[PDB]
Each structure stands twice: as C-alpha cells, then as structure tokens.
Amino acid sequence: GSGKRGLAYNNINLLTAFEGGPFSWSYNWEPRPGGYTAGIEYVPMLWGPRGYGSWNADAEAGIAAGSKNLLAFNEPDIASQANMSPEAAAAAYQKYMNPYAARARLGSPAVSNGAPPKGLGWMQGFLDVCAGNCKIDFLAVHWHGPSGNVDDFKRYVSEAIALGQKYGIGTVWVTEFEGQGDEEAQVNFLKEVLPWLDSNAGVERYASFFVDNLVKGGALTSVGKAYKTI
Numbered sequence: 429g430s431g432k433r434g435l436a437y438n439n440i441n442l443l444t445a446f447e448g449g450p451f452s453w454s455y456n457w458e459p460r461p462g463g464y465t466a467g468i469e470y471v472p473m474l475w476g477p478r479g480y481g482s483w484n485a486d487a488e489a490g491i492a493a494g495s496k497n498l499l500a501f502n503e504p505d506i507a508s509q510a511n512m513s514p515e516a517a518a519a520a521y522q523k524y525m526n527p528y529a530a531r532a533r534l535g536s537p538a539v540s541n542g543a544p545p546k547g548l549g550w551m552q553g554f555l556d557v558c559a560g561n562c563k564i565d566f567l568a569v570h571w572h573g574p575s576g577n578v579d580d581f582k583r584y585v586s587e588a589i590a591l592g593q594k595y596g597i598g599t600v601w602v603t604e605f606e607g608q609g610d611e612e613a614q615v616n617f618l619k620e621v622l623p624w625l626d627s628n629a630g631v632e633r634y635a636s637f638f639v640d641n642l643v644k645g646g647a648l649t650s651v652g653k654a655y656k657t658i
C-alpha cells in the first residue's frame with residue numbers, strides 16, 4: 429500500500445495474523461519489542477518517567493537492531509497514562525530523546541484528542557516550553573471516538589498537522605486511531621479514513637487501535653481483514 433500502515437500490539441504472537449499485509453512498522457507502548465518479528469520496523473517508545481532508568485540502553489539496542497525512529501511519552505496529558513506537565517516533558521525530551529536525533533527520527537509525546545488543556549492544548553504548551561530546543565521530526569497524536577465522527581477525526585488530524593507546522597514540524601504520525609462501533613461500523617470507518625490518510629501529505633504513518641482487538645482465535649476479524657486489504 430502507501431507504506432504508512434503500522435501494527436500497534438501487546439501480544440507479539442498476534443502479529444503473524446497480519447503477515448504479508450501492507451504494514452511497514454510496529455510499536456508496543458514499550459521500549460523493547462518482547463521478541464523479534466521479521467520484515468517490520470519495530471519503533472521503541474519512551475512511555476513515561478518509569479522508562480528513564482533503562483531508556484539509553486533500550487534506544488541503543490533499538491538503533492542497533494535496525495530501528496530508525498523513536499517515540500516519546502504516551503499521553504502525558506492523561507493522568508492515568510504518562511501524566512507529565514508540558515514543562516516536565518520538554519526538559520525530559522531534551523535529556524532522553526535529543527541525543528538520538530543524528531541516528532533516529534524522533535516523535536513527539538503522543539497526546540489524546542481531549543479538549544484543551546489536554547490533547548493539542550497540551551501539545552502546544554509542550555512546543556512552547558521546548559522553545560525550539562526539542563529535536564522533533566514528527567508529532568504523534570491519538571483519536572478515539574464513534575465511527576460516525578469521521579468529520580471530527582479529520583478535523584483533529586488537520587489541527588495536529590497545522591500545529592506542527594506553526595513550530596516547524598512538517599508531519600504527524602497518528603499512532604492510535606479508533607472509529608468505534610459494531611464490526612460493520614468499524615469497517616465503514618476504515619473505508620472512509622484509510623484512503624484519506626494514505627493521500628494526506630501531513631501524515632507519514634498511522635496505526636489503527638490496535639492489533640490485539642483486530643485478531644480473535646488466531647484469525648483476523650472482519651475489521652482486521654479490512655485494515656489488511658483497504
């Protein structure tokens with residue numbers, strides 16, 4: 429396909445269901461892959477402050493095993509996720525992500541689609557505290573909501589692209605998106621947004637949320653099959 433489509437996983441043993449599809453890349457919300465999967469670029473994630481102790485080793489290991497991208501904190505805007513102030517994330521990004529910029533493309537912390545001061549509000553606060561000192565190759569963003577809200581998904585992704593552009597960051601990865609409903613509604617959502625993302629110059633990569641919901645009893649669900657085939 430486009431080369432944009434990724435596999436976001438928990439159970440590594442479910443990636444096999446997707447073997448041969450138009451998938452370039454994977455991530456697992458962890459700094460280490462939990463094994464090896466041939467033919468796919470694994471992208472390590474510095475999920476939050478619990479990861480600081482191992483991160484330099486984890487990043488070097490990922491670079492040596494062929495990773496060319498690194499992701500920063502997972503939903504620092506959400507207190508049940510990485511739970512970090514914009515100021516804290518800007519300092520930690522400069523400490524833990526910037527040193528890898530010569531050898532890996534670096535993704536921003538990934539924000540939710542919450543209203544300000546969460547979501548892209550948080551992201552703008554983070555890009556303000558960075559003050560040009562964070563080496564950011566792309567913004568990472570998340571959108572979850574009903575399958576009928578395509579309009580709101582596109583609105584959110586366009587808003588993220590525009591925000592990146594105000595701070596000299598050309599492109600985004602949509603590292604989680606989920607058009608929610610029954611399997612039929614989920615497939616209709618993918619039929620609408622997958623082509624839209626594939627032709628969007630602003631979006632480098634994306635991952636429908638997520639491999640372990642798209643696989644039941646070893647088999648792609650109708651939603652997993654649409655993710656493989658659209």
Ligand SMILES: OC[C@H]1O[C@@H](O[C@@H]2[C@@H](O)[C@H](O)O[C@H](CO)[C@H]2O)[C@H](O)[C@@H](O)[C@@H]1O
Pocket residue numbers: 438456457458475502509638
């Ligand atoms: O199990 C590995 C890591 O899983 C994390 O949960 C992920 C969320 O952060 C994310 O937004 O959703 C995915 C899929 O539901 C979750 O795997 C934990 O919060 C980490 O503690 C955990 O190490």
